[PDB]
């Protein structure tokens, strides 16, 4: 315990392994330590480290935070095998500035700390507004199809889909920078909804199982095609493909032949349960040498996030549809939901990613809350609400206290 | 001898160690000075700092260097990593807030 | 009010003129008398015993 070996980072990127005294105060080592790295750099033929104007030499963690000059290396949480960084930090002393007349003072000061509107942002605002507009247009046109079988809904939606997609193409080909692409991506993604309901609305007669087969299919196809030629915004499109594909299977089954919805819902639940274990493998196979590795790593990470998201949506819809406060053994699906939630709540630790772990953790909580609400809306009585209210507040309270205490 | 003598006057425990080895002068990185050469032969001048250490027979040193842009290594430490308890508390608070 | 508005603007340009002169003074005085904690790093520079 009398000494510790650590790697010290120096100028332009050289890493050097050194054996330091574990108890002397850090301020005593920084000077001779600097000499050693300069000697090796000079023999290596590289440019040595130098001071610039006013400043000082400091020893910091890889995060940049400097170590307190009077404390011992063992007093701080530094262990053998860690790495540190030697750095020069410039002087911040300068004259103070004062303004007497409050009007000019407020104006000058307030203009430095905040960002004003500019033409780059202006376009993104408009692009977002047009996207919101058309998803509203398809909504009312769709609501009309739910009461009338005439061609109007498909006819008018078809032309809108064509126009939006047409405009998106010019933007995509003409783009030059990431800002331009953001505008283009927002535009293209907005075309999927009109095109989707335009096909689904074509089959005559009352709406139901037969139309559903067309809708989720073209949706899945469009999402898959877009992902191929765009190669960007991986996570969200992947989620649409998964939820679209599984719904098409259920729609086709129900349309062809199904003894009960519970049968389909139970089948979907089982499919989702096994898919979670397959998710990391699927994501990994879906994906100067350094460029290839980094590109590969982030692409893989993105697919898993999307893949996890799609499954999360399906399980809550199925689970909440399977449970029921009146049908048979009312307690059987409730406890089954509990056992199902426990796996997701526990398995969340197997992934290092923050959003991936958080979404997994959140997926369990929403199911419990959703089940209680379902059992509170129906079979309505003072006992039901009184019990549900208490449960919903106690559930997370116990969870956070056990973690923070 | 004089260092141990001075330590006792300061009330500090003298230098002591166990195992096969020897006592010698070393640099801040642990590299020992040459036992057969003059301090004038070595690059030593007034105001330098040195350490007295026990060199056990088991001692081995890496003696190797590598290059990587320091600006990128520092950035990657935060660009993506594992969860933190502070974030967990924030998430817990939001959930109970959602519950009520 | 028109005379008031002109008078206020004339002062601001004097303020800006004063500020530039002050910055030249800060830059010069710091160059000759640094804060005591920064002196150690300067030992190798030609500024010593100047």
């Amino acid at each position: 315990p009398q000494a510790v070996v650590v790697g010290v980072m120096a100028g332009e990127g050289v890493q050097i392994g050194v054996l330091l005294d574990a108890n002397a105060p850090v301020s005593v080592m920084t000077d001779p330590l600097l000499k050693v790295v300069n000697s090796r750099l000079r023999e290596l033929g590289e440019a040595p480290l130098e001071a610039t104007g006013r400043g000082r030499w400091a020893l910091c963690l890889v995060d940049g935070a400097p170590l307190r000059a009077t404390q011992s290396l063992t007093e701080q949480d530094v262990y053998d095998g860690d790495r540190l960084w030697i750095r020069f930090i410039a002087d911040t002393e300068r004259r103070s500035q004062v303004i007497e007349h409050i009007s000019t003072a407020v104006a000058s000061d307030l203009s430095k700390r905040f960002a004003r509107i500019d033409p780059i942002v202006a376009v993104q605002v408009g692009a977002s507004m047009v996207a919101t507009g058309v998803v509203l247009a398809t909504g009312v046109l769709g609501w009309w199809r739910w009461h009338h079988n005439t061609w109007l809904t498909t006819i008018y939606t078809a032309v809108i889909g064509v126009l939006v997609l047409a405009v998106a193409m010019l933007l995509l080909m003409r783009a030059k920078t990431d800002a331009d692409r953001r505008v283009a991506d927002i535009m293209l993604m907005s075309a999927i909804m009109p095109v989707t309901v335009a096909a689904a609305a074509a089959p005559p007669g009352p709406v139901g199982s037969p139309q559903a087969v067309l809708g989720f299919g073209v949706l899945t196809v469009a999402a898959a095609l877009a992902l191929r030629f765009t190669g960007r915004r991986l996570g969200i499109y992947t989620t649409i493909v998964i939820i679209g594909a599984l719904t098409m299977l259920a729609a086709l089954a129900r349309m062809v032949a199904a003894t009960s919805a519970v049968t389909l819902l139970s089948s979907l639940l089982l499919i989702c349960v096994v898919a979670y274990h397959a998710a990391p493998a699927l994501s990994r196979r879906l994906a100067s040498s350094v460029r290839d590795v980094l590109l590969q790593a982030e692409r893989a990470r993105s697919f898993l996030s999307g893949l996890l998201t799609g499954l999360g949506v399906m399980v809550v819809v199925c689970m909440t549809s399977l449970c029921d406060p009146h049908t048979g053994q009312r307690w059987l699906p409730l406890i089954l939901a509990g056992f199902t939630s426990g796996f997701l709540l526990l398995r969340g630790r197997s992934y290092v990613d923050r959003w991936q772990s958080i979404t997994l953790a959140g997926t369990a909580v929403i199911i419990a809350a959703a089940v209680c609400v379902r059992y509170a809306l129906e079979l309505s009585s003072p006992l039901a609400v009184s019990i549900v209210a208490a449960i919903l507040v106690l559930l997370p309270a116990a969870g956070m206290a056990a973690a923070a205490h | 001898k004089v260092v141990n003598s001075r330590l006792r006057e300061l009330g500090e425990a003298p230098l002591e160690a166990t195992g096969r080895g020897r006592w010698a002068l070393c640099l801040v990185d642990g590299a020992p000075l040459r036992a057969t050469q003059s301090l004038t032969e070595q690059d030593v001048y007034d105001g330098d700092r040195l350490w007295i250490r026990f060199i056990a027979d088991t001692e081995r040193r890496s003696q190797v260097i590598e290059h990587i842009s320091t600006a990128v290594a520092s950035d990657l430490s935060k660009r993506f990593a594992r969860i933190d308890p502070i974030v967990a508390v924030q998430v817990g608070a939001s959930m109970v807030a959602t519950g009520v | 009010d028109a005379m008031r508005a002109q008078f206020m603007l004339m002062l601001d340009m004097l303020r800006e003129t004063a500020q530039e002169s002050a910055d030249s003074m800060d830059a010069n005085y710091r160059w000759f008398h640094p804060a005591p904690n920064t002196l150690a790093a300067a030992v190798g520079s030609p500024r010593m015993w100047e």
């Binding site: 301020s27 005593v28 000077d31 009077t70 | 007034d46 105001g47 330098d48 | 150690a40 030992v43």
Partner: peptide, 18 residues
Amino acid sequence: VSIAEAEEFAQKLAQWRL
């Protein structure tokens, strides 16, 4: 400045002569 800081500065300066 502290005593340590003074000795630290003094050691750095002692290395040089005319």
